[PDB]
Amino acid sequence: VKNPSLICAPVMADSIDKMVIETSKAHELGADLVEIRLDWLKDFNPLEDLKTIIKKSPLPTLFTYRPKWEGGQYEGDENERRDVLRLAMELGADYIDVELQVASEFIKSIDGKKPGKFKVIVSSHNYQNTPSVEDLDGLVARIQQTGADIVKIATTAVDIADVARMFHITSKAQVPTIGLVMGERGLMSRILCSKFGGYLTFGTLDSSKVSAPGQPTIKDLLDLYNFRRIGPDTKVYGIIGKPVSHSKSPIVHNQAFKSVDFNGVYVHLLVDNLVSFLQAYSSSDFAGFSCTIPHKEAALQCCDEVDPLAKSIGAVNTILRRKSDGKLLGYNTDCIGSISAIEDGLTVVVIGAGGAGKALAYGAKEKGAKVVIANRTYERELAEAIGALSLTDLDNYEDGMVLANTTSMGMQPNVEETPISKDALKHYALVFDAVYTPRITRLLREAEESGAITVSGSEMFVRQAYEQFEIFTGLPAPKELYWQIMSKYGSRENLYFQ
Numbered sequence: 181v182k183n184p185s186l187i188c189a190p191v192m193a194d195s196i197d198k199m200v201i202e203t204s205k206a207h208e209l210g211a212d213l214v215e216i217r218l219d220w221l222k223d224f225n226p227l228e229d230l231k232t233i234i235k236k237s238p239l240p241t242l243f244t245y246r247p248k249w250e251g252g253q254y255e256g257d258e259n260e261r262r263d264v265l266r267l268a269m270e271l272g273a274d275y276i277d278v279e280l281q282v283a284s285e286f287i288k289s290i291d292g293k294k295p296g297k298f299k300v301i302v303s304s305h306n307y308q309n310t311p312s313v314e315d316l317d318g319l320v321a322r323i324q325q326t327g328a329d330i331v332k333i334a335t336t337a338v339d340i341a342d343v344a345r346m347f348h349i350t351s352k353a354q355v356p357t358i359g360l361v362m363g364e365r366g367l368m369s370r371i372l373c374s375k376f377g378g379y380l381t382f383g384t385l386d387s388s389k390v391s392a393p394g395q396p397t398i399k400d401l402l403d404l405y406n407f408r409r410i411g412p413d414t415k416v417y418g419i420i421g422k423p424v425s426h427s428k429s430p431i432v433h434n435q436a437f438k439s440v441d442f443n444g445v446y447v448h449l450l451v452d453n454l455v456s457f458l459q460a461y462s463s464s465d466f467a468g469f470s471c472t473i474p475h476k477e478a479a480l481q482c483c484d485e486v487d488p489l490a491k492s493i494g495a496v497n498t499i500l501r502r503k504s505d506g507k508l509l510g511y512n513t514d515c516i517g518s519i520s521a522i523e524d525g526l527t528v529v530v531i532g533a534g535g536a537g538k539a540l541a542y543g544a545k546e547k548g549a550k551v552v553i554a555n556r557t558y559e560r561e562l563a564e565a566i567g568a569l570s571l572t573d574l575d576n577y578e579d580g581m582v583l584a585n586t587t588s589m590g591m592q593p594n595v596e597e598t599p600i601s602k603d604a605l606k607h608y609a610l611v612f613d614a615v616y617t618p619r620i621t622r623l624l625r626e627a628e629e630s631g632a633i634t635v636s637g638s639e640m641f642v643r644q645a646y647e648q649f650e651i652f653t654g655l656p657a658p659k660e661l662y663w664q665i666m667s668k669y670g671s672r673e674n675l676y677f678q
């Protein structure tokens with residue numbers, strides 16, 4: 181609905197001097213406006229303080245005086261609370277956010293007294309779930325009926341599938357609408373606003389200044405997710421998994437898309453149920469996906485067509501939604517990424533029997549010496565599917581062997597977790613670890629201390645990544661670019677996007 185989404189920054193410092201500093205920071209960061217959360221001020225002299233903020237703020241101002249009964253900090257007299265908001269408006273505020281519950285009385289009180297550039301936002305918060313379209317429609321109608329200039333609705337994501345309902349609302353409501361879904365599972369709703377008609381989204385000054393679950397930083401919205409480039413025709417892609425907050429696929433793919441000016445956007449997709457997820461997002465708006473634990477093997481089942489290599493491997497880590505009919509095509513870029521990374525580093529001991537284990541096992545077989553599998557659950561016929569061992573026995577096992585971890589052991593925040601005793605490593609010439617967050621896992625650490633050579637999971641990550649790009653865009657893999665992007669933008673550790 182209308183203009184691209186605005187980026188609003190929540191200002192919650194407990195003093196006026198500090199809020200002024202925050203509004204400046206917001207301007208510096210690239211935000212379009214700021215929401216002054218008046219209920220967070222330790223000391224508050226309405227007339228004086230409000231006057232200051234409006235004056236010193238380099239950006240348009242939206243004032244909120246959130247009461248305890250609506251999840252805010254304000255306690256006390258309701259009329260006094262309302263007087264402040266009225267003051268804000270008459271002092272030059274660009275917007276005020278008034279709660280649905282009291283919006284009618286409030287808007288009536290300012291009848292024939294609203295400044296020229298003043299807009300009233302009426303909001304509703306649902307901390308339980310995301311209602312049906314039917315109920316959302318009714319809520320929109322109710323908010324409209326109060327005389328609101330802008331409809332504002334914040335719901336909670338029980339499942340990632342809930343976002344689609346919110347997109348339908350912001351995309352089809354014929355009134356300026358701010359629709360957001362809270363929680364990590366709703367993050368996508370905060371990023372794709374400009375594609376689905378959202379009037380505004382909230383971005384933080386930093387990872388610690390969050391006013392609601394799921395809010396990303398302004399910097400990430402602008403530089404990581406290329407927010408300004410997102411539009412109605414932009415195609416959406418994302419990494420499917422659980423957990424998914426550690427993934428850097430959104431970093432690399434978005435840079436690449438921008439670099440070649442491809443009209444696409446890549447986001448994190450926290451999926452609990454893969455089957456329902458793919459069902460909830462089958463429209464042409466969602467052109468492709470990457471898959472990690474625990475959906476690599478499951479994706480294979482959901483694809484309409486599977487690449488011979490993927491079928492032969494038994495798992496899919498890349499999905500493409502064919503424009504032609506609209507079906508899903510499964511591919512596997514893990515195999516070539518793992519094998520090449522390893523060979524470059526230069527009997528293979530594969531740790532893990534999941535999708536990554538399958539791929540790496542297959543490739544190790546197809547290219548030289550034979551391998552043996554070692555999974556937490558002994559049963560995971562894998563060793564006989566390509567020509568076995570129980571995890572606990574791995575410690576008990578030549579002197580120039582190769583070890584390849586494809587499990588999540590050691591992945592952040594489980595930094596002190598390793599899949600094998602450092603005493604065994606003494607028998608390996610090379611050790612690979614598919615885990616790339618952190619770059620140097622405990623395994624790789626004690627491996628280099630064990631005198632062996634180490635191959636980082638980033639080597640495999642970048643390789644399998646540019647192959648997905650080619651699959652997604654149909655453009656030749658810009659390999660050199662991906663190595664550059666990973667080096668310049670994907671080097672920081674302990675990052676969680678949620």
Ligand SMILES: O=C(O)C1=C[C@@H](O)[C@@H](O)[C@H](O)C1
Pocket residue numbers: 419426427428429430470471472473497498513514536644
């Ligand atoms: O962390 C990630 O974003 C990924 C990890 C690997 O499993 C890859 O196979 C997947 O395509 C993306």
